[PDB]
Design an enzyme around this catalytic site. Structure first.
Site, PDB file in Angstrom:
ATOM      1  N   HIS A 206      69.495 -12.382   9.837  1.00  0.00           N
ATOM      2  CA  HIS A 206      69.511 -10.936   9.701  1.00  0.00           C
ATOM      3  C   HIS A 206      68.378 -10.359  10.538  1.00  0.00           C
ATOM      4  O   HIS A 206      67.283 -10.901  10.490  1.00  0.00           O
ATOM      5  CB  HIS A 206      69.372 -10.507   8.241  1.00  0.00           C
ATOM      6  CG  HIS A 206      70.364 -11.125   7.316  1.00  0.00           C
ATOM      7  ND1 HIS A 206      70.182 -11.095   5.952  1.00  0.00           N
ATOM      8  CD2 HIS A 206      71.513 -11.801   7.517  1.00  0.00           C
ATOM      9  CE1 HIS A 206      71.196 -11.710   5.360  1.00  0.00           C
ATOM     10  NE2 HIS A 206      72.018 -12.139   6.292  1.00  0.00           N
TER      11      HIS A 206
ATOM     12  N   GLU B  63      64.504 -21.080   3.960  1.00  0.00           N
ATOM     13  CA  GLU B  63      64.213 -19.925   4.799  1.00  0.00           C
ATOM     14  C   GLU B  63      62.722 -19.604   4.751  1.00  0.00           C
ATOM     15  O   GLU B  63      62.227 -19.308   3.670  1.00  0.00           O
ATOM     16  CB  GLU B  63      65.000 -18.709   4.309  1.00  0.00           C
ATOM     17  CG  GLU B  63      64.697 -17.425   5.064  1.00  0.00           C
ATOM     18  CD  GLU B  63      65.216 -16.171   4.389  1.00  0.00           C
ATOM     19  OE1 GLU B  63      66.132 -16.264   3.535  1.00  0.00           O
ATOM     20  OE2 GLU B  63      64.654 -15.102   4.659  1.00  0.00           O
TER      21      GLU B  63
ATOM     22  N   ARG C 264      76.436  -4.730  -0.208  1.00  0.00           N
ATOM     23  CA  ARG C 264      75.986  -5.899   0.538  1.00  0.00           C
ATOM     24  C   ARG C 264      77.199  -6.643   1.109  1.00  0.00           C
ATOM     25  O   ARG C 264      77.095  -7.823   1.432  1.00  0.00           O
ATOM     26  CB  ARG C 264      75.085  -6.752  -0.372  1.00  0.00           C
ATOM     27  CG  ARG C 264      74.068  -7.647   0.331  1.00  0.00           C
ATOM     28  CD  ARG C 264      73.407  -8.669  -0.576  1.00  0.00           C
ATOM     29  NE  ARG C 264      72.588  -9.602   0.188  1.00  0.00           N
ATOM     30  CZ  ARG C 264      71.284  -9.471   0.426  1.00  0.00           C
ATOM     31  NH1 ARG C 264      70.626  -8.398   0.023  1.00  0.00           N
ATOM     32  NH2 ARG C 264      70.645 -10.406   1.110  1.00  0.00           N
TER      33      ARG C 264
ATOM     34  N   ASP D 267      63.118 -27.178  40.413  1.00  0.00           N
ATOM     35  CA  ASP D 267      64.464 -27.323  40.952  1.00  0.00           C
ATOM     36  C   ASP D 267      65.446 -26.634  40.003  1.00  0.00           C
ATOM     37  O   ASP D 267      65.727 -27.158  38.929  1.00  0.00           O
ATOM     38  CB  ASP D 267      64.829 -28.788  41.216  1.00  0.00           C
ATOM     39  CG  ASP D 267      66.232 -28.970  41.776  1.00  0.00           C
ATOM     40  OD1 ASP D 267      66.633 -28.157  42.639  1.00  0.00           O
ATOM     41  OD2 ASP D 267      66.910 -29.934  41.362  1.00  0.00           O
TER      42      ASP D 267
ATOM     43  N   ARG E 140      73.327  -7.880   9.809  1.00  0.00           N
ATOM     44  CA  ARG E 140      73.372  -9.174   9.132  1.00  0.00           C
ATOM     45  C   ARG E 140      74.335 -10.166   9.783  1.00  0.00           C
ATOM     46  O   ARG E 140      74.317 -11.332   9.392  1.00  0.00           O
ATOM     47  CB  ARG E 140      73.734  -8.963   7.663  1.00  0.00           C
ATOM     48  CG  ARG E 140      72.780  -8.033   6.919  1.00  0.00           C
ATOM     49  CD  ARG E 140      73.391  -7.349   5.719  1.00  0.00           C
ATOM     50  NE  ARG E 140      73.530  -8.291   4.609  1.00  0.00           N
ATOM     51  CZ  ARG E 140      74.660  -8.846   4.156  1.00  0.00           C
ATOM     52  NH1 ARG E 140      75.849  -8.516   4.642  1.00  0.00           N
ATOM     53  NH2 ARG E 140      74.599  -9.711   3.152  1.00  0.00           N
TER      54      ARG E 140
ATOM     55  N   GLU F 252      67.612 -18.836   8.944  1.00  0.00           N
ATOM     56  CA  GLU F 252      67.758 -19.778   7.847  1.00  0.00           C
ATOM     57  C   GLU F 252      68.243 -21.093   8.441  1.00  0.00           C
ATOM     58  O   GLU F 252      68.992 -21.075   9.411  1.00  0.00           O
ATOM     59  CB  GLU F 252      68.756 -19.295   6.798  1.00  0.00           C
ATOM     60  CG  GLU F 252      68.730 -17.802   6.510  1.00  0.00           C
ATOM     61  CD  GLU F 252      69.756 -17.352   5.483  1.00  0.00           C
ATOM     62  OE1 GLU F 252      70.375 -18.216   4.807  1.00  0.00           O
ATOM     63  OE2 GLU F 252      69.943 -16.129   5.358  1.00  0.00           O
TER      64      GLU F 252
ATOM     65  N   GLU G  54      68.919  -3.184   9.056  1.00  0.00           N
ATOM     66  CA  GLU G  54      69.114  -4.621   9.064  1.00  0.00           C
ATOM     67  C   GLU G  54      70.568  -4.870   9.439  1.00  0.00           C
ATOM     68  O   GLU G  54      71.456  -4.429   8.725  1.00  0.00           O
ATOM     69  CB  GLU G  54      68.778  -5.257   7.717  1.00  0.00           C
ATOM     70  CG  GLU G  54      69.067  -6.758   7.644  1.00  0.00           C
ATOM     71  CD  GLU G  54      68.974  -7.365   6.252  1.00  0.00           C
ATOM     72  OE1 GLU G  54      68.300  -8.392   6.100  1.00  0.00           O
ATOM     73  OE2 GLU G  54      69.574  -6.809   5.313  1.00  0.00           O
TER      74      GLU G  54
ATOM     75  N   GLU H   2      67.020 -21.640  -0.948  1.00  0.00           N
ATOM     76  CA  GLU H   2      68.124 -20.815  -1.418  1.00  0.00           C
ATOM     77  C   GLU H   2      68.610 -21.410  -2.733  1.00  0.00           C
ATOM     78  O   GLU H   2      68.889 -22.601  -2.788  1.00  0.00           O
ATOM     79  CB  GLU H   2      69.302 -20.734  -0.451  1.00  0.00           C
ATOM     80  CG  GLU H   2      70.118 -19.452  -0.575  1.00  0.00           C
ATOM     81  CD  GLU H   2      69.583 -18.276   0.228  1.00  0.00           C
ATOM     82  OE1 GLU H   2      69.077 -18.512   1.347  1.00  0.00           O
ATOM     83  OE2 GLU H   2      69.710 -17.122  -0.242  1.00  0.00           O
TER      84      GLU H   2
ATOM     85  N   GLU I 136      65.427 -13.157  10.255  1.00  0.00           N
ATOM     86  CA  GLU I 136      65.294 -13.985   9.066  1.00  0.00           C
ATOM     87  C   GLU I 136      66.081 -15.270   9.303  1.00  0.00           C
ATOM     88  O   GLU I 136      67.129 -15.463   8.676  1.00  0.00           O
ATOM     89  CB  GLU I 136      65.780 -13.216   7.839  1.00  0.00           C
ATOM     90  CG  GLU I 136      64.933 -12.013   7.464  1.00  0.00           C
ATOM     91  CD  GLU I 136      65.463 -11.223   6.279  1.00  0.00           C
ATOM     92  OE1 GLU I 136      66.598 -11.494   5.808  1.00  0.00           O
ATOM     93  OE2 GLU I 136      64.747 -10.302   5.840  1.00  0.00           O
TER      94      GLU I 136
END
Lengths: 435, 435, 435
Positions: free
Chosen positions: A236, A187, A306, A51, A326, A132, A324, A179, A130
């Site tokens: 990321h 992570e 970064r 449904d 982020r 976390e 990548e 971390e 990645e």
């Protein structure tokens, strides 16, 4: 992998139940459990009538049922159920045409990959996210008419057994770091797969994390900013394109990156706010994309910097040359987020969109008479949804995204944006109660 | 009213202390108390040296002291202090030139009125605001690193004695209604005065309300939206212009309203978002200006429609012909809010800005393919501050607002906007913790 | 010991995870856990790519990743993890040159030993530290805006099973005494090794102590002064130098001590405050190096006196002739502390620095018109860091310590020195609240 092996697995493991799982446009994982004896050879060519009114965004009250068609290659034993259960991921199909539903995230991801193979730009796409999460000892939250509250009360054993269960469920794990600075932020990393396979793996990842935490008397959250001042949870995404077993992102330009890759980055940069509507779908998601400090907010690419949202990781191998991005967060719907990133990249490749020049700079550290100048990700969920409403075209290429599906998605996100917008916030009492 | 009568009042009432009061750019009321014997005839022509570094936005650490110059016409006995105190409102002056400080709200209001008289458009302006507040039995709020909370726990006696104290302190009160539907929401109405006098009366109003509530073991708040779903606290402002004792807003056009009045409304509509930066200065303020239901959000004028932000009240007298703007909230700084409204109106009169046509419609009740079409007030504090940053010109006419003052105001509001933006909200846990 | 034996150990013990461990400049032990199947023969010649931004003092935000290169000779099974884990200590290498990172403590220790072998003064150095810890039943500490608090609530079984686990993890234990007088103060002694091996053993020592205490529901601390009046936790370091299997510290002078040894002591005495910056890195560390009573504060050497910081233990064997320095504390970073002591000694040997005459005296027991005369260790962390900033040269010999590394270390210690300096202390309320 075929249906016959699934029936063999049913007899071998003495499976009692089969859990058919699918994903809403919200990303939440819905399920229907059937007895193992109701799974026959015929069950894999008619699916199960469902449904389709209950789920939000999907078929309304007058347009009726859908079909759950299982993917036999996604079968895996559930480690957490006492009665031995076999999980199978299903697609939602229209009962008449027996084709992928327009508002089905998994069907949209499959369509995105099919369009990729159709355009002839590449043969396959490799996605490495990645995600976390935060592990807490306890949490209490609530919001009545007479106020609101949240209270969060903050190991190797939890993660290591998470990694073991994830490898039971067909994930290939490859690191398990805590971390260093952020309390509770953990992570687990995993190996790259194709888009739809990796999205299925992201659903399994979240399932395992949540359930293993509950076993240890903890609470895990994939919420982009559950705590003030401490760094947010990101996801990321490393993208690669392959054609007949070679990277299209390997070349001779900046950081050994190919021309096709540069247009991919250009396309991601141009549509990054329309993407942000899908990759950053929550209002919490923009408390970690805040203008200023430690934000993957700057839409530029750099192998060194970064503070750029798009990184070019350095690898001692042409066979691993990826980009990548982020800004995406783990609250995203993996299918819709990944489809959006791929389609932005393909629109960049198709239209020869040049990203510009690498920002080997120190962003944030730039005076704010140039912080203003650089393109930025969306500042709020409203801005992102408005940009998506205006910039639909890149998602509609090859009919991957329907106008109707985009409209339903936007409306469903707005009904939550509005609830957040109109509730009174405790910090606004601290600042303005006396004033 | 002169200084001599103030010294007479000191001897008559046996005053022990004199409380010199001024207003920050935030609208908060600061004070310095001196003994009654330190008030001499000379004190009214040198003022009192003050350290102008503590207050935010004002003179920094290297640029030094300011002067408190009392206004002897604003003297009134404090009803709440045990030791008989005389309140005097003061202006902040630069110690050298002995002129009104550029970042002083009261000085800015005086400058706005002086510019009004200079331009020759009118002789005086009458402001009638309607500040509404919430009375609660109790409240607890807080925000640590590990969460946030607020809890609000909800009479004629309180308001009636509020009205009595307000009439002790020189306000002329003219109604005291409770709001029929909204728990705790009360409103005392008062007679119209000129801009600066009325702003002083709004400061006295808030002071009386807060202190009388504390006497009865309650807590009053002028915060635009302290409670979900229930209607927000507004401050509707009635404006009139007078020249040599006749309204300039009385005429023959729509609802007996004059040509000058129509350009006033045009000017208010055009700059309403720059105004919103000053009249709606809090982030809480845009939880009551929400797109959709029961919002004074629609920038149009109508004598009938009450979804229009600008109302034209119907009075059986040409001597009372005014325009009511309904978007301002009681968290505004009365001096800056009123100066902004007057300057927008004067820019409308000067540039012959036509407002358009009266929206004798039913707004909200309009389909949202025309809800989009009409001009709207700012959607968030960031949008309002950005519009103010771009639309400075109308505030700078006649040097009423300095670029430096506007910059300092914007920065000081942004440091609070950002604190609200980056704290995690309890409703975002309800919606996205599991997701 | 090679990689092949490590892979053999993986298959033999049925290891599931491999824990790669390294040390910050703070001395804290960081880790990354990978699945055992991700450890291949190739893994020992590329290491693992790590994000070197999180750790404090190390590579900033613009300079990017580092390499974890495992030392296969440091492999040991973790006794405390439920899922069988193999611990491997790693070096941090620059991804390009593939050389030891300049801000890596382990790399600095290796460089110090290499410089020792380069200068030709000796072939190897033997370090024997004596780290002491406190066992408590419970502890609660905290420091908000509105105050601060600490509360400490004070066996053979704990230490004996500590000794057993330490011998599982490759340490050779040789005594396990409780301190007779001091509540909770315990000490396990171990056999001498070379500098880097002994520093690795000190990391294993601390790990075992902390975890074994938690098993028994206790809390162990290596903090130099956790309790008032009771004697502090020290880490006395015995140094020896060997060349082709003979002591260079064995001779014919005072207490059978050689000329080379006397210059070693001279060098340690001269630079003892620059050393104190590394051996005594906490502000707590100078509550046990207090001027006056029971302090290893006096920078002189004596076989008899135990108020001298440098002791010459008496052994009935020329093969065991060492110098014991008693000022270092167990909060030191073993790599940086040991490198500093070795380099001070080598600078003393190189420059023929004569220590002077043995203080066969009773220090403290000296009148304080001669207590002033003798050289003392640094009085505070600020003094030690300033002396280090001025006396860098002895650490830079042979490029062991970079100026950049020393600068980063000093800055990172100062940010903690300042936090201690500006928080209000409870004893200052006892003395000065009323005053």
């Amino acid at each position: 992998m075929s249906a016959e092996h699934v029936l063999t697995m049913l007899n071998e493991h003495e499976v009692k139940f089969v859990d058919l799982r699918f994903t809403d446009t919200k990303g939440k994982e819905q399920h229907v459990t059937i007895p193992a004896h109701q799974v026959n050879a015929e069950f894999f060519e008619e699916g199960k009538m469902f449904d389709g009114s209950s789920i939000g965004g999907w078929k309304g009250i007058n347009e009726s049922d859908m079909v759950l068609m299982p993917d036999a290659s996604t079968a895996v034993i559930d480690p957490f159920f006492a009665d031995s259960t076999l999980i199978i991921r299903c697609d939602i199909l229209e009962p008449g045409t027996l084709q992928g539903y327009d508002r089905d995230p998994r069907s949209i991801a499959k369509r995105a990959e099919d369009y990729l193979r159709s355009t002839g730009i590449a043969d396959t796409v490799l996605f490495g996210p990645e995600p976390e999460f935060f592990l807490f000892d306890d949490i209490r939250f609530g919001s009545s008419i007479s106020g609101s509250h949240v209270a969060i009360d903050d190991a190797q054993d939890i993660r290591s057994e998470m990694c073991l269960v994830m490898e039971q469920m067909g994930l290939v794990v490859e690191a398990h770091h805590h971390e260093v600075a952020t309390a509770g932020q953990n992570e687990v990393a995993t190996r790259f797969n194709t888009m739809t396979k990796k999205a299925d793996e992201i659903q399994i990842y979240k399932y395992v994390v949540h359930n293993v935490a509950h076993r240890f008397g903890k609470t895990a959250t994939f919420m982009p900013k559950p705590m003030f001042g401490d760094n947010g949870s990101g996801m990321h995404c490393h993208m690669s394109l392959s054609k007949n077993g070679v990277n299209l992102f390997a070349g001779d330009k900046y950081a050994g990156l190919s021309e096709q890759a540069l247009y991919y980055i250009g396309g991601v940069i141009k549509h990054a706010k329309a993407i942000n509507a899908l990759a950053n779908p929550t209002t919490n998601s923009y408390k970690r994309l805040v203008p200023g400090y430690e934000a993957p907010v700057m839409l530029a690419y750099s192998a060194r910097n970064r503070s750029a949202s798009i990184r070019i990781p350095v690898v001692s191998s042409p066979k691993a040359r990826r980009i990548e991005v982020r800004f995406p967060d783990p609250a995203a719907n993996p299918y819709l987020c990944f489809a959006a990133l791929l389609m932005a990249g393909l629109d960049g490749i198709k239209n020869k969109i040049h990203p510009g020049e690498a920002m080997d700079k120190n962003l944030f550290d730039l005076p704010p008479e140039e912080a203003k100048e650089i393109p930025q990700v969306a500042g709020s969920l409203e801005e992102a949804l408005n940009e998506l409403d205006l910039d639909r075209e890149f998602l509609k290429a090859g009919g991957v995204f329907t106008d109707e599906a985009i409209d339903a998605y936007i409306a469903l996100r707005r009904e939550e944006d509005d609830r957040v917008r109109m509730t009174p916030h405790p910090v606004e009492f601290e600042l303005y109660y006396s004033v």
